[PDB]
Amino acid sequence: IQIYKYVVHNVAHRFGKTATFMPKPMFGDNGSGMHCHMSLAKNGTNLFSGDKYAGLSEQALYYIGGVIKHAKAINALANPTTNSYKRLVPGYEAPVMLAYSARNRSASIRIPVVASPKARRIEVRFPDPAANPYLCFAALLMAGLDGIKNKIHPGEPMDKNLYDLPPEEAKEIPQVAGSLEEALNALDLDREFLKAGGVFTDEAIDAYIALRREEDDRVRMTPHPVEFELYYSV
Amino acid sequence: SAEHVLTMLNEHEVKFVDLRFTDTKGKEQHVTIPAHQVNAEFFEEGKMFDGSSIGGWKGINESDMVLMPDASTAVIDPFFADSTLIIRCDILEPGTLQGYDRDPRSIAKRAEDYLRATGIADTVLFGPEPEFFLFDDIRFGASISGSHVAIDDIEGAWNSSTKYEGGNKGHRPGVKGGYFPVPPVDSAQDIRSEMCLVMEQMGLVVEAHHHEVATAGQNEVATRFNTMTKKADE
Ligand SMILES: Nc1ncnc2c1ncn2[C@@H]1O[C@H](COP(=O)(O)OP(=O)(O)O)[C@@H](O)[C@H]1O
Numbered sequence A: 001i002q003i004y005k006y007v008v009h010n011v012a013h014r015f016g017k018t019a020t021f022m023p024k025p026m027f028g029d030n031g032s033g034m035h036c037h038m039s040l041a042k043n044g045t046n047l048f049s050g051d052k053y054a055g056l057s058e059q060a061l062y063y064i065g066g067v068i069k070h071a072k073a074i075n076a077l078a079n080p081t082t083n084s085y086k087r088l089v090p091g092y093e094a095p096v097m098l099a100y101s102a103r104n105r106s107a108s109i110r111i112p113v114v115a116s117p118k119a120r121r122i123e124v125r126f127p128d129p130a131a132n133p134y135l136c137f138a139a140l141l142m143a144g145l146d147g148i149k150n151k152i153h154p155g156e157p158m159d160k161n162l163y164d165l166p167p168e169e170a171k172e173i174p175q176v177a178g179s180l181e182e183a184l185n186a187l188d189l190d191r192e193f194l195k196a197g198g199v200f201t202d203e204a205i206d207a208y209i210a211l212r213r214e215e216d217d218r219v220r221m222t223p224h225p226v227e228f229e230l231y232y233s234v
Numbered sequence B: 001s002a003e004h005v006l007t008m009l010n011e012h013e014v015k016f017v018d019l020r021f022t023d024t025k026g027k028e029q030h031v032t033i034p035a036h037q038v039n040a041e042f043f044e045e046g047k048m049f050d051g052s053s054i055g056g057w058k059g060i061n062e063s064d065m066v067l068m069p070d071a072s073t074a075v076i077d078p079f080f081a082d083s084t085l086i087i088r089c090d091i092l093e094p095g096t097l098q099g100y101d102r103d104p105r106s107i108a109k110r111a112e113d114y115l116r117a118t119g120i121a122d123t124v125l126f127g128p129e130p131e132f133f134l135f136d137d138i139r140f141g142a143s144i145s146g147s148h149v150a151i152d153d154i155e156g157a158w159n160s161s162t163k164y165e166g167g168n169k170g171h172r173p174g175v176k177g178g179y180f181p182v183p184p185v186d187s188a189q190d191i192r193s194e195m196c197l198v199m200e201q202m203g204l205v206v207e208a209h210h211h212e213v214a215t216a217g218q219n220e221v222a223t224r225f226n227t228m229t230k231k232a233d234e
């Protein structure tokens, strides 16, 4: 990913352009996401293929359950910028509903329908390119493992619709964090699954949170152009 | 009264009489004669003019027609530099002095007549509420290589970003946000009232005035209803 970004940034520069991996540079058009396809393996066999839903193993489902359980904390690493949340907004294709499906592209977790069981895997859609590769991937794993170790069942797949109509039962099903602060706070509280195996230390986590809170503050404290449009004549 | 007119000529030291009428499209038209051309004849036989000049009227052979002053409509023009009296006219067929088939005022009068004739009622009441826009700049064109239209007004929301000589004072009605913010957001109070005062000096009765919904100067002056033909005159 690091090399990828490096190549993109530099080839662009050499061509007289400038590239950005910001998640939402423009209001009104697509943001940039970084979907993450994942699967586990042992001695060459795909631990995610099985007889359960869409060709999945029950291990895959526990993994999904883990990701869903710790989504808000993962957000702090997979969507580490205030800008990230301008992409994750109640929109139609917004990968914000904490659920899985092989079709419903409202679900932040898609299940690719593929023939070869060797290629069975899950696609977590909410990450964006601003995410630290390392920390984002790691947090995704640890959440998955904790989903397994604790056999966290996913529940049933959402094949209905996204955030708008639905709007039936006010459609308050699982959702990803709605702001960076919220995500940072989740990471704060829900840190155990990351400390497992001594992978993440409290100090590391607290330091990361502090770095991002400083960023969150700049945006929270600086008047926004739109605020003038909305309130100058108040 | 043709006598009331002759006294208004002396009372206001009128130098000209502006004869007005409307074409098929609805546009008021006019021609002017010195006050000294107003005599007894004028009222009984009107003045002659070329029909073929107005769109959709007489063709190649029957050009000439009659302008019949309606003495009830006499009112002073509040804008012209030299004292002038406006007198609305009907368009009559020469000799027969009937009322041109294509004269919109004659048509409206005929309709008021037919109302009384059927005996269904003796008068029709119309209370129209015309709305309008006030701009600073309007540009447009169309030729073989293209076409365009550009609108501009100090109230236009788009000018929130415009650089102005003495600074942008920026209190503007947003899109669909013109319904009643007090000045300075509403920049047309003084003008709406002048329109009211002048309208009344011309015989209309004003009920209210206010900014309308649209940004960029939509406004409205509400006037009291009147009998159909007199209202169209209004
Ligand atoms: N027969 C009638 N009796 C009373 N008022 C009438 C009659 N016929 C028409 N009107 C007209 O109703 C109009 C005025 O009010 P307005 O505040 O502009 O209403 P709206 O909120 O529908 O725009 C005037 O044109 C008024 O004179």
Ligand SMILES: [Mn+2]
Residues within 6 Å of the ligand: A035, A123
């Ligand atoms: Mn994808």
Ligand SMILES: [Mn+2]
Residues within 6 Å of the ligand: B129, B131, B212, B220
């Ligand atoms: Mn109105």
